[PDB]
Scaffold this motif. Structure first.
Motif, mmCIF file in Angstrom:
data_model
loop_
_atom_site.group_PDB
_atom_site.id
_atom_site.type_symbol
_atom_site.label_atom_id
_atom_site.label_comp_id
_atom_site.label_asym_id
_atom_site.label_seq_id
_atom_site.Cartn_x
_atom_site.Cartn_y
_atom_site.Cartn_z
ATOM 1 N N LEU A 64 11.107 0.706 -8.158
ATOM 2 C CA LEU A 64 9.840 0.152 -8.641
ATOM 3 C C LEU A 64 9.017 -0.529 -7.527
ATOM 4 C CD1 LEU A 64 8.020 -0.161 -11.110
ATOM 5 C CD2 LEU A 64 9.239 -2.264 -11.660
ATOM 6 N N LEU A 65 9.678 -1.161 -6.552
ATOM 7 C CA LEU A 65 8.959 -1.709 -5.381
ATOM 8 C C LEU A 65 8.306 -0.579 -4.592
ATOM 9 C CD1 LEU A 65 11.270 -4.520 -3.935
ATOM 10 C CD2 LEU A 65 8.922 -4.800 -4.706
ATOM 11 N N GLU A 66 9.036 0.525 -4.480
ATOM 12 C CA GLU A 66 8.572 1.719 -3.789
ATOM 13 C C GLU A 66 7.350 2.255 -4.507
ATOM 14 O OE1 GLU A 66 11.775 4.707 -2.929
ATOM 15 O OE2 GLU A 66 13.097 2.951 -2.723
ATOM 16 N N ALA A 67 7.410 2.282 -5.841
ATOM 17 C CA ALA A 67 6.223 2.647 -6.630
ATOM 18 C C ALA A 67 5.039 1.734 -6.336
ATOM 19 C CB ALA A 67 6.528 2.617 -8.126
ATOM 20 N N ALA A 68 5.268 0.430 -6.357
ATOM 21 C CA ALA A 68 4.197 -0.512 -6.042
ATOM 22 C C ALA A 68 3.536 -0.181 -4.702
ATOM 23 C CB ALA A 68 4.739 -1.947 -6.038
ATOM 24 N N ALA A 69 4.357 0.032 -3.673
ATOM 25 C CA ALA A 69 3.828 0.270 -2.330
ATOM 26 C C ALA A 69 3.085 1.604 -2.234
ATOM 27 C CB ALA A 69 4.964 0.212 -1.289
ATOM 28 N N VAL A 70 3.704 2.652 -2.770
ATOM 29 C CA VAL A 70 3.118 3.983 -2.688
ATOM 30 C C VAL A 70 1.809 4.028 -3.470
ATOM 31 C CG1 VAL A 70 3.324 6.348 -3.481
ATOM 32 C CG2 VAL A 70 5.186 5.279 -2.209
ATOM 33 N N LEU A 71 1.795 3.369 -4.624
ATOM 34 C CA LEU A 71 0.580 3.269 -5.441
ATOM 35 C C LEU A 71 -0.494 2.547 -4.647
ATOM 36 C CD1 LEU A 71 2.022 2.753 -8.989
ATOM 37 C CD2 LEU A 71 0.654 4.605 -8.093
ATOM 38 N N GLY A 72 -0.111 1.466 -3.970
ATOM 39 C CA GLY A 72 -0.996 0.822 -3.009
ATOM 40 C C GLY A 72 -1.632 1.762 -1.980
ATOM 41 N N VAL A 73 -0.827 2.584 -1.304
ATOM 42 C CA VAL A 73 -1.365 3.561 -0.353
ATOM 43 C C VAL A 73 -2.290 4.607 -1.026
ATOM 44 C CG1 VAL A 73 -0.819 5.368 1.379
ATOM 45 C CG2 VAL A 73 0.631 3.349 1.178
ATOM 46 N N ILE A 74 -1.914 5.061 -2.213
ATOM 47 C CA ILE A 74 -2.712 6.055 -2.918
ATOM 48 C C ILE A 74 -4.077 5.499 -3.330
ATOM 49 C CG2 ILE A 74 -2.903 7.369 -5.061
ATOM 50 C CD1 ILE A 74 0.236 7.712 -4.844
ATOM 51 N N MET A 75 -4.091 4.326 -3.974
ATOM 52 C CA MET A 75 -5.349 3.731 -4.422
ATOM 53 C C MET A 75 -6.201 3.277 -3.245
ATOM 54 S SD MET A 75 -5.117 4.492 -7.452
ATOM 55 C CE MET A 75 -4.031 4.645 -8.886
ATOM 56 N N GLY A 76 -5.573 3.132 -2.076
ATOM 57 C CA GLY A 76 -6.256 2.670 -0.882
ATOM 58 C C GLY A 76 -6.867 3.783 -0.053
#
Lengths: 278, 270
Positions: B180-192
């Motif tokens: 789930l932390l990995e999801a948070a980070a990857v989602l961060g890169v995607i939305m960014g």
């Protein structure tokens, strides 16, 4: 409810679609290691089903000119969500069923903790499976619309709200609209989306599916007072006669949504409404 | 020294804007919502939505653009806490001095509230972000969130946790914490608007960070790292995790990288 040729055809249709759905579901959750996970998920998912929701999804996709193949991962997704809701419904805290379709309920096999978790896994797997397969087959805007529709069918505007409230007539229709109809509506709309159909077709078949869901719940109450010596229900709120009237109005309302579609392509949905009403 | 204090303030700021957004995301005005809000708005460190936001900023995005994904990962975290508290699992009567969800609303409502949060994460993230980002990215964001939750994610971790050593422990920590932390980070890169290659780096960062958290927690406490591999090799594993995390932050402007360096540090030096 008399035309036997279309009933025979539809009976064969159901068996074939259910077989295809069962194969694709089996493949959707592979027996790969770690078996502890996969087995608890597979147990309730691959248990016998009529598979009416994925069938509806497939049939609608075919109606608007699509293929079964294209609709299959969305169809599997709705069956996964439906399965998740049944797992949690059966829980001791809620319905407390020991049995489901003659076989032990999930928590009765794996424990309550594992059953809760299995429900959660199925909810996630629906979105994953549907998106990872369907994104290669439809325009990305359609894929996004499909995800939104699924999510909305599950939530506070859909299935979960209906479960919670299920713990005068307008209340009963609320429960039926949310516990049963929302996920059927989702199935039909995903069918149109996966079949490349139009916005108009989406709303027509949403209406179709709503009628079909309500019809299923009315006919369920009718069948119960009609065949259980013990028997909040439609026959006790508005009588048995008017209950049958309501069923028939719902069925004709569902059927009218299919006017103008190709008779041949429409036949399974006509027959689905007849099958339910009788 | 001072840098850790800056990070403290950073976390408090980000947490308060996340709490605001979370309040807005489950409108109290009904026709259910109450059981959901009770746990979602109870207050936490909000470390996963912060990671999502910090990472979005890292690659040159906005907080505003990442906020719905950040809220979605907090909804999933909140869902797993509610289900974890249940009698059939951890059977906690209290959470942060406060009665747990099932103790206020009943076990059925708690179960349902968990399910609602799972659906709302996808609905909220997808409706708002779709929105702000190219549709292919939106699609990928849905796939990443979905993959973090289930049979290859958080739930796998929970199931296997219900049951000699290191393979098992690493599996549990990687699935129950890291996924789930990995999801948070990857989602961060995607939305960014970030790249694939930034995605892989930050997935790696998040993973190192989650693992680091669990190893350091085991070390502080003296089926754990120090009993399976020894105390000394546990401290070695902690240090190489911390540094692995920092090496993922190479190639970004120091200033933009600073909160992620500081977060790695903050987890290391507890």
């Amino acid at each position: 409810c008399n035309d036997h040729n279309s009933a025979f055809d539809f009976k064969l249709y159901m068996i074939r679609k259910a077989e295809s759905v069962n194969a694709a579901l089996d493949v959707s959750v592979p027996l790969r290691e770690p078996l502890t996970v996969q087995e608890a998920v597979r147990y309730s998912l691959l248990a016998g089903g009529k598979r009416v929701r994925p069938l509806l999804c497939i049939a609608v996709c075919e109606l608007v000119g699509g293929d079964e193949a294209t609709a299959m991962s969305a169809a599997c997704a709705v069956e996964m969500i439906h399965t998740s809701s049944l797992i949690h419904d059966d829980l001791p805290c809620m319905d407390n069923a020991d049995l489901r379709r003659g076989k032990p309920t999930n928590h009765k096999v794996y424990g309550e903790d594992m059953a809760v978790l299995a429900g959660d896994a199925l909810l996630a797997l629906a979105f994953e499976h549907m998106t990872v397969v369907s994104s290669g087959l439809v325009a990305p805007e359609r894929m996004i619309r499909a995800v939104v529709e699924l999510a909305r069918a599950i939530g506070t505007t859909g299935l979960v709200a209906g479960q919670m409230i299920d713990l005068g007539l307008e209340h009963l229709e609320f429960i039926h609209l949310h516990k049963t109809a929302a996920l059927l509506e989702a199935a039909a709309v995903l069918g149109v989306i996966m079949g490349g159909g139009t916005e108009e077709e989406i709303e027509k078949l949403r209406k179709y599916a709503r009628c079909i869901g309500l019809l299923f719940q009315v006919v369920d109450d009718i069948l119960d007072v009609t065949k259980s010596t013990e028997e909040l229900t439609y026959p006790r709120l508005i009588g048995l006669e008017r209950s049958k009237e309501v069923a028939e109005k719902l069925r004709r309302e569902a059927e009218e949504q299919l006017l103008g579609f190709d008779p041949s392509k429409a036949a399974p949905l006509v027959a689905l409404a007849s099958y339910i009403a009788c």
